[PDB]
Amino acid sequence: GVRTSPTGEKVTHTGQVYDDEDYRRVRFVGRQKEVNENFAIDLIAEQPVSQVGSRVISCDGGGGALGHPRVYINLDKETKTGTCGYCGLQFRQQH
Amino acid sequence: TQLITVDEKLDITTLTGVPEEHIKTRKARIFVPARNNMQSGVNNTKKWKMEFDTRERWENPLMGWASTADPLSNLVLTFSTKEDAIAFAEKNGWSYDVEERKVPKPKSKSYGANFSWNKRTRVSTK
Amino acid sequence: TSVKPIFSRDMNEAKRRVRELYRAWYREVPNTVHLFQLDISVKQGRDKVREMFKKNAHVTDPRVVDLLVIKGKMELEETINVWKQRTHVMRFFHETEAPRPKDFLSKFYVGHDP
Amino acid sequence: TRPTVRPRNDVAHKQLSAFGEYVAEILPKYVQQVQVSCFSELEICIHPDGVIPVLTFLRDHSNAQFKSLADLTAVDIPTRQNRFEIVYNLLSLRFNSRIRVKTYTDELTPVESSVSVYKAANWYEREIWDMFGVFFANHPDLRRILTDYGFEGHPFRKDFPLSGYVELRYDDEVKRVVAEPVELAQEFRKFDLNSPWEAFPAYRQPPE
Amino acid sequence: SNIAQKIRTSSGVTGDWKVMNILHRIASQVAALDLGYKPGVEAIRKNPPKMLFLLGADGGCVTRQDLPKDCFIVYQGHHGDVGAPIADVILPGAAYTEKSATYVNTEGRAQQTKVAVMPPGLAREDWKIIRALSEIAGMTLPYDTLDQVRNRLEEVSPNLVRYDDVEGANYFQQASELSKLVNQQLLADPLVPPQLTIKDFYMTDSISRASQTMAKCVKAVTE
Amino acid sequence: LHHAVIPHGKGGRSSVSGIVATVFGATGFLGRYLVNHLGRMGSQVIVPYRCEPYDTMHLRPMGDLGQIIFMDWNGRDKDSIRRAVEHSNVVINLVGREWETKNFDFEDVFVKIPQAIAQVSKEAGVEKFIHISHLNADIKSSSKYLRNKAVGEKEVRETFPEATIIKPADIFGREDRFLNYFANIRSLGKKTVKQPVYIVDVTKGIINAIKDPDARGKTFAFVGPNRYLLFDLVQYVFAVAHRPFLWTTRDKVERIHTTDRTLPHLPGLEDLGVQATPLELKAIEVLRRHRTYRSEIEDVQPA
Amino acid sequence: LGLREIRIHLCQRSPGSQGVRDFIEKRYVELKKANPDLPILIRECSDVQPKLWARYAFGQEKNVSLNNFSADQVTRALENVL
Numbered sequence A: 001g002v003r004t005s006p007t008g009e010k011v012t013h014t015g016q017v018y019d020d021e022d023y024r025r026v027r028f029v030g031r032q033k034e035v036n037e038n039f040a041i042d043l044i045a046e047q048p049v050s051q052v053g054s055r056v057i058s059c060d061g062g063g064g065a066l067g068h069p070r071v072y073i074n075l076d077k078e079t080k081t082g083t084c085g086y087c088g089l090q091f092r093q094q095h
Numbered sequence B: 001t002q003l004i005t006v007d008e009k010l011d012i013t014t015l016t017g018v019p020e021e022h023i024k025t026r027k028a029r030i031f032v033p034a035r036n037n038m039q040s041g042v043n044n045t046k047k048w049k050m051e052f053d054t055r056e057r058w059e060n061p062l063m064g065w066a067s068t069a070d071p072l073s074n075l076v077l078t079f080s081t082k083e084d085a086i087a088f089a090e091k092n093g094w095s096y097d098v099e100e101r102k103v104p105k106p107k108s109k110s111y112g113a114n115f116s117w118n119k120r121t122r123v124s125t126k
Numbered sequence C: 001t002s003v004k005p006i007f008s009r010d011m012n013e014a015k016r017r018v019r020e021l022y023r024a025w026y027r028e029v030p031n032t033v034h035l036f037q038l039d040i041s042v043k044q045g046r047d048k049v050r051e052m053f054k055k056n057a058h059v060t061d062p063r064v065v066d067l068l069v070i071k072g073k074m075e076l077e078e079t080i081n082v083w084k085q086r087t088h089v090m091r092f093f094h095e096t097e098a099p100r101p102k103d104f105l106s107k108f109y110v111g112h113d114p
Numbered sequence D: 001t002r003p004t005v006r007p008r009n010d011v012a013h014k015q016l017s018a019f020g021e022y023v024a025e026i027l028p029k030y031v032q033q034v035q036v037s038c039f040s041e042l043e044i045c046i047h048p049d050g051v052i053p054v055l056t057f058l059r060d061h062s063n064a065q066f067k068s069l070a071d072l073t074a075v076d077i078p079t080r081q082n083r084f085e086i087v088y089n090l091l092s093l094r095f096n097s098r099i100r101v102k103t104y105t106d107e108l109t110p111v112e113s114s115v116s117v118y119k120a121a122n123w124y125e126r127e128i129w130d131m132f133g134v135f136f137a138n139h140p141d142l143r144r145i146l147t148d149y150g151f152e153g154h155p156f157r158k159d160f161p162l163s164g165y166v167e168l169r170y171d172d173e174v175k176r177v178v179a180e181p182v183e184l185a186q187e188f189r190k191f192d193l194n195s196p197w198e199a200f201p202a203y204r205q206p207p208e
Numbered sequence E: 001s002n003i004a005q006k007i008r009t010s011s012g013v014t015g016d017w018k019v020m021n022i023l024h025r026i027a028s029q030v031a032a033l034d035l036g037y038k039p040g041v042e043a044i045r046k047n048p049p050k051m052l053f054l055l056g057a058d059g060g061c062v063t064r065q066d067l068p069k070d071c072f073i074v075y076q077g078h079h080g081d082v083g084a085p086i087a088d089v090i091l092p093g094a095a096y097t098e099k100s101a102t103y104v105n106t107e108g109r110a111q112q113t114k115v116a117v118m119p120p121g122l123a124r125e126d127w128k129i130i131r132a133l134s135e136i137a138g139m140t141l142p143y144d145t146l147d148q149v150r151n152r153l154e155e156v157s158p159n160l161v162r163y164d165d166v167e168g169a170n171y172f173q174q175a176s177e178l179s180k181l182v183n184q185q186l187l188a189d190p191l192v193p194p195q196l197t198i199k200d201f202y203m204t205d206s207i208s209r210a211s212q213t214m215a216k217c218v219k220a221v222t223e
Numbered sequence F: 001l002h003h004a005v006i007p008h009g010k011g012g013r014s015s016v017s018g019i020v021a022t023v024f025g026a027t028g029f030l031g032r033y034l035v036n037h038l039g040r041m042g043s044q045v046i047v048p049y050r051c052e053p054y055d056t057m058h059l060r061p062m063g064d065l066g067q068i069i070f071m072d073w074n075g076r077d078k079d080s081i082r083r084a085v086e087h088s089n090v091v092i093n094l095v096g097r098e099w100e101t102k103n104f105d106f107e108d109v110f111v112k113i114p115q116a117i118a119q120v121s122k123e124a125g126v127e128k129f130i131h132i133s134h135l136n137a138d139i140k141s142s143s144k145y146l147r148n149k150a151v152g153e154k155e156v157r158e159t160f161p162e163a164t165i166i167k168p169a170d171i172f173g174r175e176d177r178f179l180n181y182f183a184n185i186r187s188l189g190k191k192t193v194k195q196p197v198y199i200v201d202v203t204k205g206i207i208n209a210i211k212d213p214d215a216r217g218k219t220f221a222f223v224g225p226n227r228y229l230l231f232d233l234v235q236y237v238f239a240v241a242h243r244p245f246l247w248t249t250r251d252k253v254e255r256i257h258t259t260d261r262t263l264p265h266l267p268g269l270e271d272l273g274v275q276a277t278p279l280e281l282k283a284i285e286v287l288r289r290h291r292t293y294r295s296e297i298e299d300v301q302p303a
Numbered sequence G: 001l002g003l004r005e006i007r008i009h010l011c012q013r014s015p016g017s018q019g020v021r022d023f024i025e026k027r028y029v030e031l032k033k034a035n036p037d038l039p040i041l042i043r044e045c046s047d048v049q050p051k052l053w054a055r056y057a058f059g060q061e062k063n064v065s066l067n068n069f070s071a072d073q074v075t076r077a078l079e080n081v082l
């Protein structure tokens, strides 16, 4: 689920793992580097690419006042799916 | 009353409590701030800001912040004329560089010359 | 520029008040160094009192010297009372500076410091 | 204009206009600006030679009682020659009125020290001396209220920075609390929030 | 200058208009010719030295191949790419957003930078390094701080304190008659500027060479 | 050196100086003052402790937010010591109890402790290891204490050759052992030259030796500026303590009757460059607790 | 040994600038024809005292002031220096 450097310490979702010439490896002695082991990139590549039969479609976020404000996105390119900046989940068109 | 008669500069620098390091080490840039060029508004003009030079802002080695050995760096003194700026800077003691106020040039634009006959001011796209 | 005074008329009363205040600070030190249980001999305390009086030596305006006399008289009253503690009287000194040097070369080895 | 807009009254506005004109008629020597704002509170802007005559007149005279004294401050304004503005804020008891006597001064001028005609102004005057730096002559006691004894610099000015020059910490060398120059752990990010586009056209000063 | 004197003669003098002017590429050449340096590298081609200071030598100015064995190249600057492997002593000078400098444009106006960010690393300023080097060597430079440096700057050339202000020169006749002593053969080879296209605008500096955004738009233009 | 090891700006209190010091012992007297001066420098101090966390709690608020760090260790396992000096710029050895126990003796504390830590700090790959030892530590007799410290000096000179052996005299301070031991009594009268040196001059010497190289390898000795007699020292400390009066082991009394001598074959304070202070100022500092309420500066200064 | 540089510092409205402009318009091609390798350089800013600086021999910078000297007097003092 997570990568780990050959120094033995876990990387994060941001690649900030320390080198061989630091002292923060010594500040982590005896106390665990509480890293979130749940990356945010790979939980979207597992999502189904939705296919909506219109041309320009809405995005709420699953609930009135529970979610991002409405974005209306366009689906006119043929090789690149439209992508909500808030959501991150894609759409396509069907005709 | 009005007993004192003297025409001399003021010497408040020994009264304002700031030490000699921050008296004779730094310098005051006195300037109208430039217009924030992405916006288009000169309400940010008309105020002579006095600011100081910036100094070192290293990294706090536990979080990654910007620690600083600078009390005076986060000041700004908005004034209304260059003369009172120079008077305050010479009164309160420190050095000063007074920059210049650069007005926008009064141009003359004309839509009728944007649609001329023989001249090269033919926009060809509107 | 007919300015209202504080106390004086010219530098003569300024010199008179500052020598009165120095006489008071001279006769005020050994009582305090016996009272607050400090760690510094009387001669060093008197030398730094006269150093504090020699620090402001380039001041010429009579109102400013009057206001410095007022500052010194306020602090002498607060030290002849027992209001100020051992901390502030030791804070007048400088024992915990590890003081930064003034040569250009040692300011160059620890740089970004004009 | 009826919902969610504060309704102003004109009776108090006319009365405070008439009373400010009356005050400036009967005291011609010390009066420069007589202004009434939109929300009807009187302001009288005053030369610093008449603090005792204006306040002895205003505590008495039986047509304006003004027994009570409130805030005194001397708002630290640069850009002028005379910086500080001392604001006596007088409240009556028989009348329900509020006037602000605003006298001006610079850094090195004794104003006439209203402690003899308002006993409430004792700690107000001592606090303004300690925080701003305006000396008050013919006054019983000036000490430092609301500041440390070893601290100085008159910190409420615009010239004194936000963080001070000294910072205390305990150390075990001399076994006590010592003062050191400030080494902050975070920057205090100052934000550039003053956006353009002139949110009030009614307050445009005339240009050069 | 022949064209300039030709229009100077064969016309009525309508005013102090100036026909002739040149333009430069880098501002420090204008500053170094104001302070009175030798332009070109011919004085080094004549006398090969035993010690040389490369204050930001960008390209193939000199190498170790154009010089005797005991080189002693002291490079001083930031992110050197050509010469920094070749050099002997590397000193980390500051950058153009990182020090209080004094720059001259192509028309003589003096414009100064401001210290917005202190240089990362040890990374001292340039004249600070040079005066400390003077102190550690057996001599001295007779000034301490930056106001004394700018006072010597005025005591070398006076226009470098009147900031953001211009004053043009004169004496086109004297310059033209001083040009009339040495005749050179004009080679009829096709003269061409090197700045011919977008890629050669984008790559031909050290700061633009070190970046990645310039490399991205270089491959975008060339592809 | 990597970045975040370069210094930044002024000194102390989230002003990053450029050293990471692993400081052994450090719970007692001299280590606490040295951690005080390193927190004033603005460094990272790795203190290992084997005791209760209450004593490192009392020395805790010295450094800034997360500058100093705490870790456990023992005198038996090399793994915890190598974990302590995994990544460290410098390491200093300040250890040793003035009386025996049932688990650790004068034997093999000064032989088994510094060999193990010097071995693992050479193998971990650090530089500038500073070891304190007592003055006049010789193979010659009359103290198990002093002969064990002499064997320790020889062993830390043998392994890890680029070490800084430094040796103070009988240091005195605010929470001293021997001067407080003199004040807490009831006594004899003999003659013995002895020179105390004040603790803040010694630790300024240590921090100058720890950040000022060209002093690596050479052993240093701290000499106080006084060098006078013990009998007049006892009478001066009683006269400043306002009392006339005309764990106490045999090794301690033979240490305070050992004639401390100095040899100028190794340089002192001036070739390192910090001013020394005389007795009397700091003596009037430390000699509190006279009586209920209760100057005559003796200043014998023999030879 | 000898000279290295001669620097002239001028202005645009002065009787001293009038005198040194008389010199520098009448007798400058002569001087540059005489000494080839002396970079005698001229500077003009807005208004300053017309200084004349001779830099040579390990930073010896000798100073003369050409305030209200006429062109003969300028040439005589310049030959006194050089």
Ligand SMILES: NC(=O)C1=CN([C@@H]2O[C@H](COP(=O)(O)OP(=O)(O)OC[C@H]3O[C@@H](n4cnc5c(N)ncnc54)[C@H](OP(=O)(O)O)[C@@H]3O)[C@@H](O)[C@H]2O)C=CC1
Pocket (backbone or CB within 6 Å): F024, F025, F026, F027, F028, F029, F030, F031, F049, F050, F051, F075, F094, F095, F096, F097, F098, F104, F109, F132, F133, F134, F135, F168, F169, F170, F171, F177, F178
């Ligand atoms: N008269 C003096 O004070 C002089 C002292 N010295 C040297 O100074 C050093 C410190 O002395 P000082 O502070 O006065 O006395 P301490 O005994 O109190 O200091 C020694 C430190 O090391 C610890 N320690 C000692 N033995 C062991 C052990 N077996 N296992 C683990 N930790 C141990 C101590 O207790 P803890 O385990 O609780 O941490 C303490 O932290 C000594 O090495 C001594 O040789 C040198 C010259 C003069």
Ligand SMILES: [Zn+2]
Pocket (backbone or CB within 6 Å): A059, A060, A061, A068, A071, A084, A085, A086, A087, A088
């Ligand atoms: Zn969305």
